[PDB]
Protein backbone atom coordinates (compact mmCIF):
# COMPACT_ATOMS: atom_id res chain seq x y z
CA UNK A 1 0.00 0.00 0.00
CA UNK A 2 2.04 2.91 -1.37
CA UNK A 3 5.44 3.84 0.05
CA UNK A 4 7.25 1.77 -2.61
CA UNK A 5 6.27 4.06 -5.49
CA UNK A 6 7.05 6.80 -3.00
CA UNK A 7 10.75 6.04 -3.32
CA UNK A 8 11.18 4.15 -6.60
CA UNK A 9 9.16 6.71 -8.55
CA UNK A 10 10.65 9.83 -6.97
CA UNK A 11 14.20 9.71 -5.65
CA UNK A 12 15.77 8.06 -8.75
CA UNK A 13 14.08 10.68 -10.92
CA UNK A 14 16.03 13.37 -9.08
CA UNK A 15 19.72 12.50 -9.47
CA UNK A 16 19.05 12.01 -13.18
CA UNK A 17 17.23 15.33 -13.51
CA UNK A 18 18.73 17.64 -10.87
CA UNK A 19 21.87 16.33 -9.18
CA UNK A 20 21.73 15.18 -5.57
CA UNK A 21 24.92 13.90 -3.96
CA UNK A 22 22.89 12.57 -1.05
CA UNK A 23 19.73 10.49 -0.80
CA UNK A 24 18.84 12.15 2.47
CA UNK A 25 18.84 15.58 0.79
CA UNK A 26 16.00 14.15 -1.34
CA UNK A 27 12.77 16.08 -0.74
CA UNK A 28 10.37 14.20 1.54
CA UNK A 29 6.89 14.65 2.96
CA UNK A 30 7.02 15.64 6.64
CA UNK A 31 3.31 15.86 7.45
CA UNK A 32 -0.12 16.99 6.26
CA UNK A 33 -2.02 19.23 8.67
CA UNK A 34 -5.73 19.86 8.08
CA UNK A 35 -7.52 22.93 9.50
CA UNK A 36 -11.29 23.05 9.98
CA UNK A 37 -13.38 26.21 10.43
CA UNK A 38 -16.07 26.38 13.08
CA UNK A 39 -17.91 29.16 14.90
CA UNK A 40 -17.31 32.88 14.34
CA UNK A 41 -20.29 33.64 12.09
CA UNK A 42 -21.74 30.24 13.05
CA UNK A 43 -21.64 29.69 16.83
CA UNK A 44 -23.35 26.30 17.18
CA UNK A 45 -22.57 23.66 19.84
CA UNK A 46 -24.22 21.05 17.62
CA UNK A 47 -21.96 22.01 14.71
CA UNK A 48 -19.03 20.95 16.89
CA UNK A 49 -20.02 17.27 16.82
CA UNK A 50 -20.50 17.55 13.04
CA UNK A 51 -16.85 18.02 12.03
CA UNK A 52 -15.86 16.30 15.26
CA UNK A 53 -17.21 13.10 13.70
CA UNK A 54 -16.63 13.63 9.97
CA UNK A 55 -12.96 14.52 10.29
CA UNK A 56 -12.60 11.42 12.45
CA UNK A 57 -13.72 9.08 9.69
CA UNK A 58 -11.97 10.66 6.73
CA UNK A 59 -8.50 10.50 8.32
CA UNK A 60 -8.97 7.79 10.98
CA UNK A 61 -7.56 10.03 13.72
CA UNK A 62 -9.28 12.12 16.42
CA UNK A 63 -8.72 15.89 15.86
CA UNK A 64 -8.19 18.62 18.48
CA UNK A 65 -10.66 21.47 18.72
CA UNK A 66 -8.37 24.47 19.17
CA UNK A 67 -9.71 27.65 20.81
CA UNK A 68 -9.45 31.43 20.23
CA UNK A 69 -6.18 33.38 20.33
CA UNK A 70 -7.33 35.39 23.38
CA UNK A 71 -7.97 38.50 21.27
CA UNK A 72 -11.05 40.72 21.41
CA UNK A 73 -11.49 43.30 18.65
CA UNK A 74 -14.73 45.11 17.76
CA UNK A 75 -16.86 42.42 16.07
CA UNK A 76 -17.66 38.94 17.31
CA UNK A 77 -14.48 37.82 19.13
CA UNK A 78 -14.01 36.40 22.62
CA UNK A 79 -11.20 35.22 24.91
CA UNK A 80 -11.31 31.44 25.12
CA UNK A 81 -13.73 29.35 23.07
CA UNK A 82 -13.59 26.48 20.54
CA UNK A 83 -13.18 28.10 17.11
CA UNK A 84 -11.01 25.75 15.06
CA UNK A 85 -9.87 22.21 14.29
CA UNK A 86 -6.33 20.87 13.83
CA UNK A 87 -5.79 17.49 12.12
CA UNK A 88 -2.11 16.60 11.79
CA UNK A 89 -1.30 13.65 9.55
CA UNK A 90 2.24 12.38 10.00
CA UNK A 91 3.33 8.79 9.56
CA UNK A 92 1.44 5.90 7.96
CA UNK A 93 -1.97 7.54 8.15
CA UNK A 94 -0.43 10.49 6.30
CA UNK A 95 0.34 8.20 3.39
CA UNK A 96 -3.10 6.57 3.68
CA UNK A 97 -5.18 9.76 3.57
CA UNK A 98 -2.74 11.05 0.94
CA UNK A 99 -3.30 8.11 -1.41
CA UNK A 100 -7.05 8.32 -0.75
CA UNK A 101 -6.79 11.94 -1.88
CA UNK A 102 -4.68 11.58 -5.03
CA UNK A 103 -6.71 8.57 -6.13
CA UNK A 104 -10.29 9.45 -5.16
CA UNK A 105 -10.26 13.01 -3.84
CA UNK A 106 -9.05 15.27 -6.66
CA UNK A 107 -10.06 13.06 -9.64
CA UNK A 108 -13.60 12.97 -8.24
CA UNK A 109 -14.43 16.68 -8.22
CA UNK A 110 -17.12 18.58 -10.13
CA UNK A 111 -15.78 21.35 -12.37
CA UNK A 112 -12.25 20.04 -11.78
CA UNK A 113 -9.42 21.51 -13.86
CA UNK A 114 -6.48 21.23 -11.45
CA UNK A 115 -4.71 23.33 -8.80
CA UNK A 116 -2.80 26.61 -9.10
CA UNK A 117 0.66 25.77 -10.55
CA UNK A 118 2.28 28.96 -9.20
CA UNK A 119 4.77 28.49 -6.35
CA UNK A 120 2.95 29.07 -3.07
CA UNK A 121 5.13 28.66 0.00
CA UNK A 122 8.48 29.97 -1.25
CA UNK A 123 10.22 28.17 1.63
CA UNK A 124 9.88 24.66 0.20
CA UNK A 125 6.26 23.98 1.15
CA UNK A 126 2.92 23.86 -0.66
CA UNK A 127 -0.68 24.72 0.26
CA UNK A 128 -3.96 23.37 -1.14
CA UNK A 129 -7.27 25.13 -1.69
CA UNK A 130 -9.92 22.54 -0.89
CA UNK A 131 -13.46 23.86 -0.41
CA UNK A 132 -16.65 21.82 -0.72
CA UNK A 133 -16.50 18.60 1.32
CA UNK A 134 -18.83 16.59 -0.93
CA UNK A 135 -15.97 15.30 -3.08
CA UNK A 136 -14.57 12.62 -0.76
CA UNK A 137 -15.24 8.84 -0.63
CA UNK A 138 -15.86 9.05 3.12
CA UNK A 139 -18.20 12.06 3.05
CA UNK A 140 -21.75 10.80 2.59
CA UNK A 141 -24.41 13.53 2.52
CA UNK A 142 -26.93 10.72 3.04
CA UNK A 143 -25.85 10.57 6.69
CA UNK A 144 -24.46 13.85 8.05
CA UNK A 145 -25.66 17.21 9.37
CA UNK A 146 -24.72 19.86 6.78
CA UNK A 147 -22.04 20.95 4.27
CA UNK A 148 -18.80 22.77 5.20
CA UNK A 149 -15.30 23.40 3.85
CA UNK A 150 -12.03 21.77 4.94
CA UNK A 151 -8.46 22.99 4.35
CA UNK A 152 -5.47 20.76 3.51
CA UNK A 153 -1.88 21.94 3.88
CA UNK A 154 1.19 20.10 2.65
CA UNK A 155 4.36 20.12 4.73
CA UNK A 156 7.50 18.70 3.14
CA UNK A 157 11.23 18.66 3.67
CA UNK A 158 12.08 20.57 0.52
CA UNK A 159 14.70 23.35 0.38
CA UNK A 160 13.48 25.18 -2.76
CA UNK A 161 10.27 25.56 -4.81
CA UNK A 162 11.92 23.99 -7.82
CA UNK A 163 12.52 20.89 -5.67
CA UNK A 164 9.03 20.88 -4.16
CA UNK A 165 6.84 21.19 -7.27
CA UNK A 166 8.53 18.14 -8.82
CA UNK A 167 8.02 16.12 -5.65
CA UNK A 168 4.34 16.91 -5.57
CA UNK A 169 3.88 16.19 -9.28
CA UNK A 170 5.76 12.88 -9.31
CA UNK A 171 3.92 11.71 -6.21
CA UNK A 172 0.48 12.58 -7.54
CA UNK A 173 -0.73 16.09 -8.31
CA UNK A 174 -2.30 17.41 -11.55
CA UNK A 175 -1.91 21.05 -12.64
CA UNK A 176 -3.71 23.47 -15.00
CA UNK A 177 -1.45 23.33 -18.06
CA UNK B 1 -12.93 42.04 55.98
CA UNK B 2 -16.48 43.30 55.38
CA UNK B 3 -19.10 40.61 56.01
CA UNK B 4 -22.38 40.92 54.11
CA UNK B 5 -25.06 38.97 52.17
CA UNK B 6 -22.60 38.74 49.25
CA UNK B 7 -20.73 35.65 48.00
CA UNK B 8 -18.16 33.56 49.95
CA UNK B 9 -18.65 32.84 53.66
CA UNK B 10 -16.03 32.46 56.41
CA UNK B 11 -16.30 28.70 57.23
CA UNK B 12 -15.48 27.01 60.51
CA UNK B 13 -13.26 23.96 61.06
CA UNK B 14 -14.36 20.71 62.69
CA UNK B 15 -13.24 17.12 63.14
CA UNK B 16 -14.46 13.63 64.06
CA UNK B 17 -13.57 13.41 67.77
CA UNK B 18 -10.69 15.93 67.53
CA UNK B 19 -11.28 19.62 68.37
CA UNK B 20 -9.51 22.12 66.13
CA UNK B 21 -10.31 25.22 64.09
CA UNK B 22 -8.43 26.01 60.90
CA UNK B 23 -10.57 29.05 60.02
CA UNK B 24 -10.51 29.34 56.24
CA UNK B 25 -12.34 31.78 53.98
CA UNK B 26 -14.14 29.80 51.29
CA UNK B 27 -16.69 30.77 48.65
CA UNK B 28 -19.93 29.48 47.15
CA UNK B 29 -19.12 30.65 43.64
CA UNK B 30 -18.23 27.59 41.62
CA UNK B 31 -17.68 24.44 43.59
CA UNK B 32 -19.14 25.06 47.02
CA UNK B 33 -20.10 21.85 48.77
CA UNK B 34 -17.13 19.50 48.98
CA UNK B 35 -15.26 21.45 51.66
CA UNK B 36 -13.75 18.20 53.00
CA UNK B 37 -10.08 18.53 53.95
CA UNK B 38 -7.49 16.96 56.35
CA UNK B 39 -5.89 18.76 59.30
CA UNK B 40 -4.12 17.17 62.24
CA UNK B 41 -5.30 18.58 65.61
CA UNK B 42 -3.48 18.02 68.85
CA UNK B 43 -4.40 14.34 69.00
CA UNK B 44 -2.85 11.37 67.25
CA UNK B 45 -2.63 13.59 64.17
CA UNK B 46 -3.75 12.60 60.67
CA UNK B 47 -7.55 12.67 60.97
CA UNK B 48 -10.74 13.07 58.88
CA UNK B 49 -11.04 16.80 58.91
CA UNK B 50 -13.63 18.95 57.16
CA UNK B 51 -14.39 22.66 57.35
CA UNK B 52 -18.05 22.15 56.44
CA UNK B 53 -20.33 23.09 59.38
CA UNK C 1 -5.40 64.75 42.57
CA UNK C 2 -3.41 65.83 45.62
CA UNK C 3 -5.00 62.84 47.30
CA UNK C 4 -3.33 59.58 48.35
CA UNK C 5 0.25 59.09 49.58
CA UNK C 6 2.62 56.20 50.34
CA UNK C 7 5.74 56.32 52.62
CA UNK C 8 7.30 53.11 51.35
CA UNK C 9 10.85 51.99 52.18
CA UNK C 10 13.04 49.47 50.36
CA UNK C 11 16.73 49.54 49.41
CA UNK C 12 19.92 47.74 50.38
CA UNK C 13 20.32 47.06 54.11
CA UNK C 14 23.78 45.42 54.30
CA UNK C 15 26.41 46.86 51.95
CA UNK C 16 29.70 45.39 50.78
CA UNK C 17 32.51 44.45 53.12
CA UNK C 18 30.01 44.47 55.98
CA UNK C 19 30.32 41.69 58.53
CA UNK C 20 26.85 40.29 59.01
CA UNK C 21 25.26 37.59 61.13
CA UNK C 22 22.86 34.68 60.84
CA UNK C 23 19.48 36.39 60.65
CA UNK C 24 20.42 39.88 59.54
CA UNK C 25 18.48 41.09 56.46
CA UNK C 26 20.58 42.05 53.43
CA UNK C 27 18.47 43.83 50.85
CA UNK C 28 14.74 44.61 50.48
CA UNK C 29 13.29 44.64 46.97
CA UNK C 30 10.08 44.02 45.11
CA UNK C 31 11.20 41.69 42.32
CA UNK C 32 14.33 39.72 41.44
CA UNK C 33 16.95 42.46 41.09
CA UNK C 34 19.45 41.18 43.58
CA UNK C 35 19.35 37.40 43.33
CA UNK C 36 20.24 35.10 46.22
CA UNK C 37 23.81 33.86 46.00
CA UNK C 38 25.93 31.55 48.10
CA UNK C 39 24.92 31.70 51.77
CA UNK C 40 22.08 34.10 50.97
CA UNK C 41 18.43 33.03 51.34
CA UNK C 42 15.39 34.76 49.78
CA UNK C 43 12.21 35.64 51.65
CA UNK C 44 8.75 35.84 50.12
CA UNK C 45 8.90 39.54 49.19
CA UNK C 46 12.26 38.81 47.53
CA UNK C 47 14.12 39.86 50.66
CA UNK C 48 17.69 38.60 51.01
CA UNK C 49 18.81 37.39 54.42
CA UNK C 50 21.95 35.66 55.76
CA UNK C 51 22.23 32.02 56.76
CA UNK C 52 25.48 32.33 58.76
CA UNK C 53 28.21 34.82 59.63
CA UNK C 54 30.55 36.36 57.06
CA UNK C 55 31.50 39.31 54.88
CA UNK C 56 28.89 40.72 52.49
CA UNK C 57 30.35 40.35 49.02
CA UNK C 58 28.70 41.91 45.96
CA UNK C 59 28.71 40.58 42.41
CA UNK C 60 27.69 42.31 39.16
CA UNK C 61 28.05 40.39 35.87
CA UNK C 62 27.36 43.48 33.79
CA UNK C 63 23.93 44.43 35.15
CA UNK C 64 20.92 42.17 34.52
CA UNK C 65 21.64 39.61 37.27
CA UNK C 66 22.94 40.92 40.59
CA UNK C 67 24.22 38.49 43.21
CA UNK C 68 25.16 38.83 46.84
CA UNK C 69 27.28 36.31 48.73
CA UNK C 70 28.93 35.75 52.12
CA UNK C 71 32.53 34.62 52.80
CA UNK C 72 33.11 33.50 56.40
CA UNK C 73 36.02 35.05 58.34
CA UNK C 74 37.32 32.66 61.01
CA UNK D 1 1.26 74.26 16.25
CA UNK D 2 -0.49 72.22 18.97
CA UNK D 3 0.05 68.57 19.84
CA UNK D 4 -2.54 65.92 18.89
CA UNK D 5 -2.70 64.01 22.20
CA UNK D 6 -0.38 64.15 25.23
CA UNK D 7 -0.76 63.91 29.02
CA UNK D 8 -1.98 67.32 30.22
CA UNK D 9 0.29 69.35 32.54
CA UNK D 10 4.04 69.97 33.06
CA UNK D 11 6.83 71.85 34.92
CA UNK D 12 9.47 74.47 34.03
CA UNK D 13 13.28 74.74 33.66
CA UNK D 14 16.02 75.97 31.30
CA UNK D 15 19.45 74.45 30.57
CA UNK D 16 21.96 75.21 27.79
CA UNK D 17 21.11 74.40 24.13
CA UNK D 18 21.22 70.72 23.02
CA UNK D 19 20.16 69.70 19.48
CA UNK D 20 20.34 72.65 17.08
CA UNK D 21 22.85 72.65 14.25
CA UNK D 22 23.47 75.56 11.91
CA UNK D 23 22.59 74.41 8.43
CA UNK D 24 19.82 71.82 8.33
CA UNK D 25 17.30 71.34 5.48
CA UNK D 26 18.17 74.39 3.42
CA UNK D 27 20.70 77.15 2.87
CA UNK D 28 19.88 79.91 5.35
CA UNK D 29 18.75 79.69 8.96
CA UNK D 30 17.89 81.68 12.08
CA UNK D 31 19.16 81.10 15.61
CA UNK D 32 18.53 82.30 19.19
CA UNK D 33 21.07 84.14 21.32
CA UNK D 34 18.69 84.13 24.29
CA UNK D 35 16.95 81.32 26.23
CA UNK D 36 13.21 81.56 26.28
CA UNK D 37 9.72 80.19 25.66
CA UNK D 38 8.15 80.27 22.24
CA UNK D 39 4.35 80.35 22.17
CA UNK D 40 2.80 78.53 19.23
CA UNK D 41 0.98 81.66 18.06
CA UNK D 42 4.37 83.34 17.75
CA UNK D 43 5.52 80.55 15.46
CA UNK D 44 2.31 80.82 13.40
CA UNK D 45 2.90 84.54 13.05
CA UNK D 46 6.47 83.92 11.85
CA UNK D 47 5.55 81.20 9.39
CA UNK D 48 2.76 83.39 8.00
CA UNK D 49 4.84 86.54 7.52
CA UNK D 50 7.48 84.41 5.86
CA UNK D 51 4.74 83.10 3.54
CA UNK D 52 3.62 86.62 2.69
CA UNK D 53 7.18 87.52 1.76
CA UNK D 54 7.69 84.38 -0.36
CA UNK D 55 4.77 84.28 -2.78
CA UNK D 56 5.66 80.89 -4.23
CA UNK D 57 8.16 78.44 -2.78
CA UNK D 58 6.83 76.57 0.23
CA UNK D 59 10.45 75.79 1.15
CA UNK D 60 10.01 77.12 4.66
CA UNK D 61 11.28 74.66 7.28
CA UNK D 62 10.06 75.02 10.86
CA UNK D 63 11.42 72.44 13.26
CA UNK D 64 10.45 73.83 16.62
CA UNK D 65 7.05 72.30 17.33
CA UNK D 66 5.47 73.40 20.69
CA UNK D 67 5.30 70.55 23.18
CA UNK D 68 4.74 72.43 26.45
CA UNK D 69 1.27 72.94 28.04
CA UNK D 70 1.03 76.09 30.24
CA UNK D 71 -1.67 76.71 32.85
CA UNK D 72 -3.59 79.92 33.52
CA UNK D 73 -5.51 81.86 36.14
CA UNK D 74 -9.25 81.17 35.91
CA UNK D 75 -10.64 84.35 37.51
CA UNK D 76 -9.15 84.98 40.95
CA UNK D 77 -8.97 83.30 44.41
CA UNK D 78 -6.40 80.56 44.99
CA UNK D 79 -8.42 77.85 46.79
CA UNK D 80 -8.45 74.86 44.46
CA UNK D 81 -5.77 72.90 42.60
CA UNK D 82 -4.23 72.69 39.09
CA UNK D 83 -5.70 75.48 37.06
CA UNK D 84 -6.03 76.36 33.35
CA UNK D 85 -5.75 72.99 31.63
CA UNK D 86 -5.63 74.52 28.18
CA UNK D 87 -4.19 77.96 27.72
CA UNK D 88 -1.34 77.74 25.28
CA UNK D 89 1.63 75.53 24.28
CA UNK D 90 5.29 76.52 24.21
CA UNK D 91 8.50 75.42 22.51
CA UNK D 92 11.49 75.95 24.80
CA UNK D 93 14.30 77.61 22.83
CA UNK D 94 17.91 77.79 23.98
CA UNK D 95 20.76 79.82 22.32
CA UNK D 96 22.17 77.81 19.46
CA UNK D 97 18.78 76.36 18.58
CA UNK D 98 17.74 76.56 14.95
CA UNK D 99 14.15 77.74 14.80
CA UNK D 100 13.67 78.59 11.17
CA UNK D 101 15.37 77.75 7.89
CA UNK D 102 14.70 78.63 4.25
CA UNK D 103 16.35 78.00 0.89
CA UNK D 104 16.06 78.97 -2.76
CA UNK D 105 15.92 82.74 -2.36
CA UNK D 106 18.84 85.11 -2.70
CA UNK D 107 20.85 86.89 -0.03
CA UNK D 108 18.65 89.99 0.16
CA UNK D 109 15.53 87.79 0.05
CA UNK D 110 16.51 86.12 3.33
CA UNK D 111 17.52 89.15 5.41
CA UNK D 112 13.98 90.35 4.76
CA UNK D 113 11.96 87.27 5.77
CA UNK D 114 14.20 86.67 8.78
CA UNK D 115 14.27 90.36 9.77
CA UNK D 116 10.49 90.43 9.79
CA UNK D 117 9.98 87.20 11.75
CA UNK D 118 12.53 88.54 14.19
CA UNK D 119 10.27 91.42 15.17
CA UNK D 120 7.82 88.78 16.45
CA UNK D 121 10.26 86.92 18.73
CA UNK D 122 10.66 87.59 22.50
CA UNK D 123 14.44 87.32 22.10
CA UNK D 124 17.27 88.57 19.90
CA UNK D 125 18.41 86.29 17.06
CA UNK D 126 20.88 86.05 14.16
CA UNK D 127 21.33 84.78 10.62
CA UNK D 128 24.19 82.48 9.59
CA UNK D 129 25.63 80.71 6.52
CA UNK D 130 26.95 77.27 5.51
CA UNK D 131 30.37 76.31 6.92
CA UNK D 132 29.64 73.54 9.44
CA UNK D 133 29.47 69.84 8.71
CA UNK D 134 29.08 67.74 11.83
CA UNK D 135 27.06 64.57 11.34
CA UNK D 136 25.32 63.51 8.12
Amino acid sequence: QLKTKYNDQVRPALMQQFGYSSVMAVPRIEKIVVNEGLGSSKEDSKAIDKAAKELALITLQKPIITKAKKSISNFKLRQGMPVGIKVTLRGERMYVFLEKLINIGLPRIRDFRGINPNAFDGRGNYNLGIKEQLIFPEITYDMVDKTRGMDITIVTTAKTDEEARALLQSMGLPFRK
Amino acid sequence: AKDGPRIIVKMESSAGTGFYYTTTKNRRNTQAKLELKKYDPVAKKHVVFREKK
Amino acid sequence: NGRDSNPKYLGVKKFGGEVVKAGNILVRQRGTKFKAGQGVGMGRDHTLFALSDGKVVFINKGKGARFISIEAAQ
Amino acid sequence: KRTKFRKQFRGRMTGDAKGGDYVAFGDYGLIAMEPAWIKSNQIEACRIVMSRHFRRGGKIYIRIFPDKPVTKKPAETRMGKGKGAVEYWVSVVKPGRVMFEVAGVTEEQAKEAFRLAGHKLPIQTKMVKREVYDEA
Binding site: - | - | - | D16, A17, Y22, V23, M33, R56, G57, G58, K59, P95, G96, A103, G104, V128, R130, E131, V132, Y133, D134, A136
Partner: protein, 175 residues
Protein backbone atom coordinates in the same frame (compact mmCIF):
# COMPACT_ATOMS: atom_id res chain seq x y z
CA UNK E 1 49.45 76.11 9.42
CA UNK E 2 52.68 76.25 11.40
CA UNK E 3 52.07 74.25 14.56
CA UNK E 4 53.87 75.27 17.75
CA UNK E 5 53.57 74.02 21.33
CA UNK E 6 51.03 71.33 22.19
CA UNK E 7 50.46 70.92 25.96
CA UNK E 8 47.28 69.70 27.67
CA UNK E 9 46.33 72.82 29.63
CA UNK E 10 44.28 75.36 27.62
CA UNK E 11 45.60 78.18 29.84
CA UNK E 12 47.69 79.80 27.08
CA UNK E 13 45.13 79.16 24.36
CA UNK E 14 41.79 80.72 25.35
CA UNK E 15 43.32 84.17 25.84
CA UNK E 16 45.28 84.16 22.56
CA UNK E 17 43.95 83.28 19.12
CA UNK E 18 44.60 79.53 19.36
CA UNK E 19 42.25 76.58 18.79
CA UNK E 20 42.68 73.13 20.33
CA UNK E 21 43.08 70.36 17.78
CA UNK E 22 44.16 66.71 17.71
CA UNK E 23 45.38 64.20 15.15
CA UNK E 24 45.76 60.43 14.84
CA UNK E 25 45.56 57.42 12.52
CA UNK E 26 46.58 54.09 14.04
CA UNK E 27 50.03 54.68 15.53
CA UNK E 28 50.80 57.95 17.30
CA UNK E 29 48.02 60.05 18.89
CA UNK E 30 49.85 63.17 20.08
CA UNK E 31 47.58 66.18 20.61
CA UNK E 32 48.31 69.47 18.85
CA UNK E 33 47.09 73.09 18.99
CA UNK E 34 46.67 75.17 15.83
CA UNK E 35 46.10 78.87 15.14
CA UNK E 36 42.54 80.23 14.98
CA UNK E 37 42.90 82.46 11.92
CA UNK E 38 45.05 79.94 10.02
CA UNK E 39 42.32 77.32 10.37
CA UNK E 40 39.46 79.72 9.74
CA UNK E 41 41.16 80.63 6.50
CA UNK E 42 42.19 77.13 5.42
CA UNK E 43 39.17 75.02 6.44
CA UNK E 44 37.04 77.43 4.42
CA UNK E 45 38.59 76.11 1.19
CA UNK E 46 39.68 72.47 1.47
CA UNK E 47 36.94 71.76 4.03
CA UNK E 48 36.65 68.02 4.58
CA UNK E 49 37.82 66.90 1.15
CA UNK E 50 41.40 68.16 1.02
CA UNK E 51 44.55 67.71 3.06
CA UNK E 52 46.98 70.46 4.11
CA UNK E 53 50.67 70.60 5.09
CA UNK E 54 50.99 70.43 8.88
CA UNK E 55 54.53 71.25 10.03
CA UNK E 56 55.10 70.72 13.76
CA UNK E 57 57.58 72.91 15.64
CA UNK E 58 60.96 71.37 14.78
CA UNK E 59 60.67 70.09 11.22
CA UNK E 60 57.91 67.48 11.08
CA UNK E 61 55.60 67.78 8.05
CA UNK E 62 52.72 65.36 8.56
CA UNK E 63 49.84 65.20 6.01
CA UNK E 64 46.32 65.01 7.44
CA UNK E 65 42.66 65.33 6.54
CA UNK E 66 39.89 67.07 8.55
CA UNK E 67 37.36 64.61 10.00
CA UNK E 68 35.03 66.05 12.66
CA UNK E 69 34.77 69.64 13.90
CA UNK E 70 33.14 70.53 17.25
CA UNK E 71 32.26 74.21 16.79
CA UNK E 72 31.03 76.28 19.75
CA UNK E 73 27.40 77.23 20.47
CA UNK E 74 26.32 80.84 20.81
CA UNK E 75 29.30 81.64 18.57
CA UNK E 76 30.47 81.09 14.99
CA UNK E 77 34.08 80.43 16.03
CA UNK E 78 35.00 76.74 16.38
CA UNK E 79 36.54 75.38 19.58
CA UNK E 80 37.76 71.86 18.66
CA UNK E 81 38.84 69.98 15.52
CA UNK E 82 39.65 66.32 14.73
CA UNK E 83 42.33 65.40 12.17
CA UNK E 84 43.06 62.14 10.35
CA UNK E 85 46.56 61.38 8.96
CA UNK E 86 45.85 60.00 5.50
CA UNK E 87 47.61 56.69 4.85
CA UNK E 88 48.31 55.90 1.21
CA UNK E 89 45.88 53.26 -0.03
CA UNK E 90 42.71 52.87 2.02
CA UNK E 91 42.30 55.57 4.72
CA UNK E 92 38.86 56.56 6.03
CA UNK E 93 35.63 57.21 4.13
CA UNK E 94 35.33 60.89 3.21
CA UNK E 95 32.14 62.97 2.92
CA UNK E 96 31.79 64.78 -0.42
CA UNK E 97 29.18 67.56 -0.84
CA UNK E 98 26.80 67.97 -3.80
CA UNK E 99 26.78 71.13 -5.94
CA UNK E 100 24.60 71.97 -8.95
CA UNK E 101 25.50 73.51 -12.30
CA UNK E 102 23.35 74.66 -15.21
CA UNK E 103 19.77 75.93 -15.00
CA UNK E 104 17.17 73.15 -14.73
CA UNK E 105 14.21 72.76 -17.06
CA UNK E 106 11.85 72.66 -14.09
CA UNK E 107 12.91 75.89 -12.41
CA UNK E 108 11.78 77.84 -15.47
CA UNK E 109 8.43 76.02 -15.70
CA UNK E 110 7.49 77.09 -12.19
CA UNK E 111 8.94 74.46 -9.86
CA UNK E 112 12.11 74.83 -7.73
CA UNK E 113 15.29 72.74 -7.63
CA UNK E 114 15.80 71.29 -4.14
CA UNK E 115 18.81 69.32 -3.00
CA UNK E 116 17.54 66.71 -0.51
CA UNK E 117 21.03 65.87 0.74
CA UNK E 118 23.84 68.46 0.69
CA UNK E 119 26.65 66.25 1.94
CA UNK E 120 27.02 62.70 0.55
CA UNK E 121 29.41 60.16 2.05
CA UNK E 122 31.04 57.62 -0.28
CA UNK E 123 33.37 54.65 0.12
CA UNK E 124 37.12 54.52 -0.53
CA UNK E 125 37.90 58.11 -1.58
CA UNK E 126 41.42 57.14 -2.65
CA UNK E 127 44.40 59.18 -1.35
CA UNK E 128 46.06 61.87 -3.49
CA UNK E 129 42.78 61.97 -5.45
CA UNK E 130 40.08 63.13 -3.08
CA UNK E 131 36.91 64.62 -4.69
CA UNK E 132 36.72 68.21 -3.38
CA UNK E 133 33.31 68.74 -5.05
CA UNK E 134 30.67 66.83 -7.01
CA UNK E 135 29.01 67.87 -10.30
CA UNK E 136 25.51 66.44 -10.83
CA UNK E 137 23.41 67.21 -13.91
CA UNK E 138 20.19 69.02 -13.04
CA UNK E 139 18.85 70.14 -16.45
CA UNK E 140 17.53 66.66 -17.32
CA UNK E 141 14.98 67.21 -14.56
CA UNK E 142 11.44 68.53 -14.90
CA UNK E 143 8.56 68.34 -12.41
CA UNK E 144 8.57 65.60 -9.77
CA UNK E 145 11.79 64.08 -11.17
CA UNK E 146 13.83 62.22 -8.52
CA UNK E 147 17.60 61.82 -8.96
CA UNK E 148 19.33 59.22 -6.77
CA UNK E 149 23.00 58.20 -6.29
CA UNK E 150 22.66 55.67 -9.10
CA UNK E 151 22.50 58.75 -11.33
CA UNK E 152 25.62 60.52 -10.06
CA UNK E 153 28.77 60.13 -12.11
CA UNK E 154 31.67 58.58 -10.20
CA UNK E 155 34.96 60.53 -10.02
CA UNK E 156 36.72 57.37 -11.24
CA UNK E 157 37.96 54.93 -8.56
CA UNK E 158 35.19 55.78 -6.09
CA UNK E 159 32.30 53.58 -4.97
CA UNK E 160 29.07 54.78 -3.31
CA UNK E 161 28.16 54.35 0.36
CA UNK E 162 24.48 55.19 0.80
CA UNK E 163 21.58 53.17 -0.56
CA UNK E 164 21.39 53.24 -4.40
CA UNK E 165 17.78 54.46 -4.29
CA UNK E 166 18.22 57.51 -2.08
CA UNK E 167 16.95 60.85 -3.41
CA UNK E 168 19.79 63.37 -3.65
CA UNK E 169 18.08 66.12 -5.62
CA UNK E 170 14.39 66.65 -6.33
CA UNK E 171 12.50 69.46 -8.06
CA UNK E 172 9.57 70.46 -5.84
CA UNK E 173 6.37 72.06 -7.18
CA UNK E 174 5.64 75.78 -6.63
CA UNK E 175 3.81 77.22 -3.57
Amino acid sequence: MELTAKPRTPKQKLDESMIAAVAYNKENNVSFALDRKAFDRAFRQQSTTGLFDITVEGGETFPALVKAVQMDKRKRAPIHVDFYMVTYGEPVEVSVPVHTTGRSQGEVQGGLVDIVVHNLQIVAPGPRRIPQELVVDVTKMNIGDHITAGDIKLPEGCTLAADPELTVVSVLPPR
